[PDB]
Design an enzyme around this catalytic site. Structure first.
Site, PDB file in Angstrom:
ATOM      1  N   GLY A 116       0.921  -1.021  -0.074  1.00  8.79           N
ATOM      2  CA  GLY A 116       0.100   0.123  -0.177  1.00  8.79           C
ATOM      3  C   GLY A 116       0.793   1.258  -0.022  1.00  8.79           C
ATOM      4  O   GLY A 116       2.234   1.040   0.280  1.00  8.79           O
ATOM      5  N   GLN A 151       2.672  10.134   2.195  1.00  7.79           N
ATOM      6  CA  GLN A 151       3.843   9.544   2.306  1.00  7.79           C
ATOM      7  C   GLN A 151       4.956   9.851   1.499  1.00  7.79           C
ATOM      8  O   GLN A 151       6.098   9.811   1.663  1.00  7.79           O
ATOM      9  CB  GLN A 151       3.738   7.947   2.231  1.00  7.79           C
ATOM     10  CG  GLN A 151       3.005   7.395   3.476  1.00  7.79           C
ATOM     11  CD  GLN A 151       2.999   5.868   3.267  1.00  7.79           C
ATOM     12  OE1 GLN A 151       2.163   5.150   2.778  1.00  7.79           O
ATOM     13  NE2 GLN A 151       4.051   5.109   4.001  1.00  7.79           N
ATOM     14  N   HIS A 184      -4.769   0.633   7.108  1.00  4.67           N
ATOM     15  CA  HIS A 184      -3.466   1.612   7.241  1.00  4.67           C
ATOM     16  C   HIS A 184      -3.263   2.732   6.430  1.00  4.67           C
ATOM     17  O   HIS A 184      -2.999   3.520   7.053  1.00  4.67           O
ATOM     18  CB  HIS A 184      -2.633   0.345   7.136  1.00  4.67           C
ATOM     19  CG  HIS A 184      -1.067   0.824   7.147  1.00  4.67           C
ATOM     20  ND1 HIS A 184      -0.097   0.272   8.089  1.00  4.67           N
ATOM     21  CD2 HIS A 184      -0.411   1.655   6.407  1.00  4.67           C
ATOM     22  CE1 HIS A 184       0.972   0.901   7.828  1.00  4.67           C
ATOM     23  NE2 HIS A 184       1.024   1.765   6.933  1.00  4.67           N
ATOM     24  N   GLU A 185      -3.798   2.285   4.998  1.00  8.46           N
ATOM     25  CA  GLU A 185      -3.557   3.687   4.251  1.00  8.46           C
ATOM     26  C   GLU A 185      -4.316   4.731   4.632  1.00  8.46           C
ATOM     27  O   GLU A 185      -3.942   5.810   4.676  1.00  8.46           O
ATOM     28  CB  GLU A 185      -3.685   3.254   2.872  1.00  8.46           C
ATOM     29  CG  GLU A 185      -2.858   2.158   2.245  1.00  8.46           C
ATOM     30  CD  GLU A 185      -1.463   2.296   2.547  1.00  8.46           C
ATOM     31  OE1 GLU A 185      -0.851   3.402   2.675  1.00  8.46           O
ATOM     32  OE2 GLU A 185      -0.590   1.253   2.693  1.00  8.46           O
ATOM     33  N   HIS A 195      -3.103   7.015   7.468  1.00 12.33           N
ATOM     34  CA  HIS A 195      -2.346   8.086   6.826  1.00 12.33           C
ATOM     35  C   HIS A 195      -3.039   9.381   6.258  1.00 12.33           C
ATOM     36  O   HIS A 195      -2.335  10.446   6.569  1.00 12.33           O
ATOM     37  CB  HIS A 195      -1.396   7.792   5.681  1.00 12.33           C
ATOM     38  CG  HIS A 195      -0.191   6.806   5.834  1.00 12.33           C
ATOM     39  ND1 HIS A 195       0.794   7.181   6.769  1.00 12.33           N
ATOM     40  CD2 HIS A 195      -0.055   5.254   5.738  1.00 12.33           C
ATOM     41  CE1 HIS A 195       1.574   6.335   6.935  1.00 12.33           C
ATOM     42  NE2 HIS A 195       1.134   5.137   6.361  1.00 12.33           N
ATOM     43  N   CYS A 209       5.731   0.044   8.202  1.00 14.04           N
ATOM     44  CA  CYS A 209       5.341   1.322   7.462  1.00 14.04           C
ATOM     45  C   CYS A 209       6.688   1.690   6.808  1.00 14.04           C
ATOM     46  O   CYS A 209       7.647   1.715   7.600  1.00 14.04           O
ATOM     47  CB  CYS A 209       4.697   2.186   8.539  1.00 14.04           C
ATOM     48  SG  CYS A 209       4.181   4.094   7.910  1.00 14.04           S
ATOM     49  N   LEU A 210       6.444   1.878   5.639  1.00 11.59           N
ATOM     50  CA  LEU A 210       7.727   2.472   4.951  1.00 11.59           C
ATOM     51  C   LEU A 210       8.046   3.851   5.462  1.00 11.59           C
ATOM     52  O   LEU A 210       9.274   4.299   4.997  1.00 11.59           O
ATOM     53  CB  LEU A 210       7.219   2.629   3.259  1.00 11.59           C
ATOM     54  CG  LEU A 210       6.881   1.446   2.695  1.00 11.59           C
ATOM     55  CD1 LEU A 210       6.235   1.697   1.227  1.00 11.59           C
ATOM     56  CD2 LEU A 210       7.998   0.498   2.424  1.00 11.59           C
TER      57      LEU A 210
END
Ligand SMILES: CCCCC[C@H](CC(=O)NO)C(=O)N[C@H](C(=O)N1CCC[C@H]1CO)C(C)C
Ligand SMILES: CCCCC[C@H](CC(=O)NO)C(=O)N[C@H](C(=O)N1CCC[C@H]1CO)C(C)C
Lengths: 158, 158
Positions: free
Chosen positions: B46, B51, B132-133, B136, B90-91
């Protein structure tokens, strides 16, 4: 001898460490020596024995100057209800920082490596370092103490 | 064009993103293209527009297979009270993982980049990615959702 510092996620950081029972020993002195060395190489102001995978109630610290201290069998009493926020990072969590609330004022007790009793009143930064190293001896890391997650992030970014 | 992914500690990850208002546009298509590319280069399942420091209600995802999707103006309804734990990283927080509780079952709604309405029921992993996305787009990161801090640690160690 510089020791490998173990990183968050390792189970050995989640233990509750037993007491030191070899005060005044050559083995304890060597281990403390190593801890001071490992701390200096990693540029820390404190280091706790479990961070080098030694399951012992032992910490070193020293840096508002904090005196260079090795403390065995630490116990800690808050001297008041007053909390203070400050930045912390953990060598077991390289790159990260958060604002952590800690007691402004503490007493700590234990033993110098040679058996000498240590008891001190500490405040502010000095008190923070000791509370931080103490948390390690009971399997506690700073992220579980974060209240404001906006402050949790990488050092170079924050 | 691959985009720099910004890391935890950056304020731009703490915003609440406005809506996309250019569905069907060449600019939106280019941006989505970039997001798919950035996601693939970073090996994510994702990616959320903040981000890459684009303040937009926009996410991409796709991987239990999840279909490859670009979703604008997402909104999410739980379909039940049932929570499920699973691992997440998480990236924006490279190296770390924790177990995060999420709804097992959701509905999500928004728009494909061309203006097509999207509405889907999702469960398990598919539902987790979207939740999760979504976090953000409202300035929320997974560490503030951790319940068991023993599970929070580095991937190579855990
Ligand atoms: C402040 C609480 C004591 C933290 C102890 C840690 C070392 C450690 O992980 N000990 O168990 C440290 O030296 N951390 C430093 C740290 O957090 N500092 C250095 C000075 C101020 C404070 C926040 O920047 C640096 C290396 C990240
Ligand atoms: C699972 C919840 C969705 C996480 C989304 C992240 C990407 C991201 O930071 N998106 O905003 C990801 O791809 N993370 C992966 C991730 O957490 N995974 C990969 C598969 C299983 C799960 C935990 O290992 C890897 C790259 C760390």
């Amino acid at each position: 001898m510089i020791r490998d510092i173990i990183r968050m996620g390792d189970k050995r950081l989640l233990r509750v460490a037993p007491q030191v029972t070899n005060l005044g020993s050559a083995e304890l002195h060597a281990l403390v020596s190593d801890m001071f060395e490992t701390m200096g190489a990693a540029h820390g102001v404190g280091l706790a024995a479990p961070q080098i995978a030694v399951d012992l109630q032992l910490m070193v610290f020293g840096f508002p100057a904090v005196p260079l201290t090795a403390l065995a069998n630490a116990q800690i009493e808050p001297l008041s209800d007053e909390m203070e926020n400050g930045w912390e990072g953990c060598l077991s969590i390289p790159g990260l920082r958060a604002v952590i609330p800690r007691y402004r004022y503490i007493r700590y007790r234990g033993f110098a490596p040679d058996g000498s009793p240590i008891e001190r009143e500490a405040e502010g930064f000095h008190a923070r370092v000791v509370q931080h190293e103490y948390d390690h001896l009971v399997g506690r890391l700073y992220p579980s103490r974060i209240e404001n997650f906006d402050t949790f992030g990488f050092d170079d970014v924050l």
